[PDB]
Ligand binder design. Structure first.
Ligand SMILES: CC1=C(CCc2nnn[nH]2)c2cc(F)ccc2/C1=C\c1ccc(C(C)C)cc1
Ligand SMILES: CC1=C(CCc2nnn[nH]2)c2cc(F)ccc2/C1=C\c1ccc(C(C)C)cc1
Lengths: 209, 196, 196, 209
């Protein structure tokens, strides 16, 4: 149900604890979104955990990448923190930042990917049948197939002048995959929201006696 | 000697790859530097896609293009069991179960080759345009060979994220060295130590 | 909850680390930005050095700073047995065998902290100068405390390459996540999924 | 023993095959050097192989780093090939290359590390008792200890005005270790000697029918 996926999408100083709380909040947002995706909650809870663990990075990146179409040559996080290249280059994650801009954000803008298409792609990512430890990979594959079947129908209806649009959307996923991998190994997300609170906390303690 | 054999095999494989790309429609029409960049960016995934599909008739193993067979027990022995299992489960077994044919493999490899995200491309838009012509043709193919499988085309495209990450994990784990280079290097070094 | 405990423990460890550095001679005299760079560049090796030395009275395991004990059986379960064994064999057991004392550990940690190769340092030469004063002090210590062991000072310094690569490998294998974060995250996610 | 360590130091298109032969030559130079190191050849042959496998990268880097003391912002190879920073940045290995320059070449230059000192440091690297699979780790440690004992005596004799020189040499090894690791994971060596022959072979074949 493409209508159901679109409604899912729409709906002091102790630095490490503060960062974890932000991660907590963002993770919960993802869980709530997944629950609104049709049939996800019908999967075993152990399978739901595995899918979220396998997908959380790509799912987060896809979100703030699409959110950043409106913003100006930077990345808009959910927290409202507008991060520019130099903040990313200062954090030691400039390379990833450029790829996110080039391979995802810019491309989404150029093709004007909408929230329904974004939602479907993330549902496809969520329904990842290659996730290790699944009790029943086949039903996960089945749910993913229902999603892109629905996405394709949506594209041919809303954009009949673009017959290659559906495949174009799908072929952003390899970039999302590779960028996802780089983010986990550089602690991209936790560096971006964490560098300032840590440096600030550091400065205060070093200046104090 | 095993080391020279591997290096020769690489050269032959590289020759075969370059000849293959030149027979892909409109590849040679791209600027030469762009042709090089694409081949530079793609050789790993192109190679993995090739031996994965080649290994469909193999049980619990892979076939490298010169009758070189590697079993998973050996793969786990060499410390790359995890990435090896990923090749088996995410690529080989999926290719087997849906019976991906050589025409389908060819199109998917052409899509991999026509990678507009490759850094340094002078005309990324032209590369993207050629990719679109490739997957349009692949969709047309799937529709007529398997009309009863409307999701087949998308299902093919959705192996590419797996190929991408497997390719990356392979390089980071020295996949090929640990599987085919490890023992020849011991032999190599022993021979050097045998020198006067 | 298991997760909050870890972040709270992390904050405390970070607090302890900063205070330790501030009591290192001439550390607070460095420019503030350089102090931050040094603490950022060094915290991993500094922390690893600490719990390694703490774990000398433990067999086949490590003691993390809040009574948190991890045995090698658990580490292999979590998929980080190799790096864990390196910590055991290259650091802990070596610290045990030469009976490295806390003064020697302190100096080595001070040397790690005063890292002149740290990128972005405003005055690398002053950092190097402070490092030299530290290892001059450590040599004097080794000479007079253990005169019958003339190679001891060098033996201490030559654990630093092992510390360096282990620090790098720990981060690349998500060592700490896999040992103390993995299971709490499953519990965490389950709690979220069972929520209204 | 230090005199022998100094004497050890003193003494048409198939691109991959051509790269392998170059690697072959360079590796053998290292093996021949190790054989002249006292007591090395007395170790079991399986242990010698293990030590060379564990050390070959660091041993090579130390060599061309020290050789590059005379040159400006580049690396001088055994083949006589002068590789510059920007040529390395073009190959996608700019970050490591600079680290080699800053943390090794420059440091070797500033303290005027001599070939005896280089030779001793490489012997220390070679005699790595942490190498996995050694039949007798203790005798390797024993050999390493004999080396740095000899190196220290050499430093205090030749440079009595520099009492911290010996420790200064030893404390380049953590940097050598970390740079060594980065080189294995970026295919540093095989990119440096390999990028040009491959691009050439590609261009000529793509130009051909
Ligand atoms: C890239 C690469 C390394 C460099 C290190 C590496 N990177 N990723 N995996 N290994 C290596 C090292 C070796 F020893 C042997 C092979 C290789 C190799 C590639 C390769 C793959 C398959 C084949 C078959 C056609 C025979 C030949 C060469
Ligand atoms: C850096 C880090 C990650 C980030 C990922 C990582 N990097 N390297 N290893 N893991 C992580 C994730 C977790 F889940 C749990 C811990 C950690 C962690 C470090 C750490 C170590 C000890 C303690 C106290 C017990 C003293 C707290 C935090």
């Amino acid at each position: 149900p493409v209508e159901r996926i679109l409604e899912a999408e729409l709906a002091p100083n102790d630095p490490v604890t503060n960062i974890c709380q932000a991660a907590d909040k963002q993770l919960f947002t993802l869980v709530e979104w997944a629950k609104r995706i049709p049939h996800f909650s019908e999967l075993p809870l152990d399978d739901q955990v595995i899918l979220l663990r396998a997908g959380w990075n790509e799912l987060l990146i896809a979100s703030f990448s699409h959110r950043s179409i409106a913003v100006k040559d930077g990345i808009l996080l959910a927290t409202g923190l507008h991060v520019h290249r130099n903040s990313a280059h200062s954090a030691g994650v400039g390379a990833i930042f450029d790829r996110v801009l080039t391979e995802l954000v810019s491309k989404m803008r150029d093709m004007q990917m909408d929230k329904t298409e974004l939602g479907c792609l993330r549902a496809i990512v969520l329904f990842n049948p290659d996730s290790k430890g699944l009790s029943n990979p086949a039903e996960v594959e089945a749910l993913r197939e229902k999603v892109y079947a629905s996405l394709e129908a949506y594209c041919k209806h809303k954009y009949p002048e673009q017959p290659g649009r559906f495949a174009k959307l799908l072929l952003r996923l390899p970039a999302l995959r590779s960028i996802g991998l780089k983010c986990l190994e550089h602690l991209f997300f936790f560096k971006l929201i964490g560098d300032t609170p840590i440096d600030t906390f550091l400065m205060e303690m070093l200046e104090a006696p």
